[PDB]
């Protein structure tokens, strides 16, 4: 049903006067489609999905111009933030910016976002109304006063409610075969005898898209979190995702336990039970 377009910018200063490194990646849902990397030779926005390669030279020329403009702002922002936090040039520092839009089933606007981080913590964020700002600390209050007086929220709002949604719809139709799919998880359970006294049940979900999934354990139909382990959802490298959930159980009590899988691609949520 619902969809998102998100861009992720990472700008890292070098010790001393070295040029910073600027990285940009774009996603539709869990599917990467563009990259920029100032360390690479091209100095161009580059395609990273087959369906974006159909866009002509005007598209690539435009995205390259814009991403270089973003890098020049981030270059100055690294300098300003060293000033606001009284830091020397000798240390490497990071700015991050994430922005984009979500649409529902009707492919109409649902929400926009723009968030900015310095050295791995919040710095400033646009609130959900796309009209006002959250400053994380006293330095960010300067940025907030500046961006309010300049009506920066109005400019972002026009992009997030307008451009961002119009292009997400174009990408969804042009990349339909890859972006409008759900790959249901391939599921199975394993059993490993840790000792004579305990066994590990491991519930597996493989080859699914999109990445959003819930794996839970139950014992006699009640939630079980004690003696369970859940790994982070991980990319397969082929456009699909993987995840597992394990529970350590007393030998002879395996049949009390069920694994539960929820995913957009499943007709119905799955219940797995260890079968000898």
């Amino acid at each position: 049903g619902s969809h998102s377009m998100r861009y992720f910018f990472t700008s890292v200063s070098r010790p001393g006067r070295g040029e910073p490194r600027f990285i940009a990646v774009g996603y539709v849902d869990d599917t990467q489609f563009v990259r920029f990397d100032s360390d690479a030779a091209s100095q161009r926005m580059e395609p990273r999905a087959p369906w974006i390669e159909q866009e002509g030279p005007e598209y690539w020329d435009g995205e390259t111009r814009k991403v270089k403009a973003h890098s020049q702002t981030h270059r100055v922002d690294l300098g300003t933030l060293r000033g606001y936090y009284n830091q020397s040039e000798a240390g490497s520092h990071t700015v991050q910016r994430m922005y984009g839009c979500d649409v529902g089933s009707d492919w109409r606007f649902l929400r926009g976002y723009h968030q900015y981080a310095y050295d791995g913590k919040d710095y400033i964020a646009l609130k959900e109304d796309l009209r006002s700002w959250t400053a994380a600390d006293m330095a960010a209050q300067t940025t907030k006063h500046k961006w309010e007086a300049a009506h920066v929220a109005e400019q972002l709002r026009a992009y997030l409610e307008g451009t961002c949604v119009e292009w997400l719809r174009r990408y969804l139709e042009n990349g339909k075969e890859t972006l409008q799919r759900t790959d249901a998880p391939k599921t199975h359970m394993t059993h490993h005898a840790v000792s004579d006294h305990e066994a590990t049940l491991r519930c597996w979900a493989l080859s699914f898209y999109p990445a959003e999934i819930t794996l839970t354990w139950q014992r006699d139909g009640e939630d079980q979190t004690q003696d369970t382990e859940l790994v982070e959802t991980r990319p397969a490298g082929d456009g699909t995702f993987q995840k597992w959930a394990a529970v350590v159980v007393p030998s002879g009590q395996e049949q009390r336990y069920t694994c539960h899988v929820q995913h957009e691609g499943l007709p119905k949520p799955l219940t797995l039970r260890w079968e000898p």
Binding site: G26, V67, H70
Partner: peptide, 9 residues
């Protein structure tokens, strides 16, 4: 596509 207008912090 990305945006063009990026006011410094």
């Amino acid at each position: 596509i990305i945006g063009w207008m990026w006011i410094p912090v």
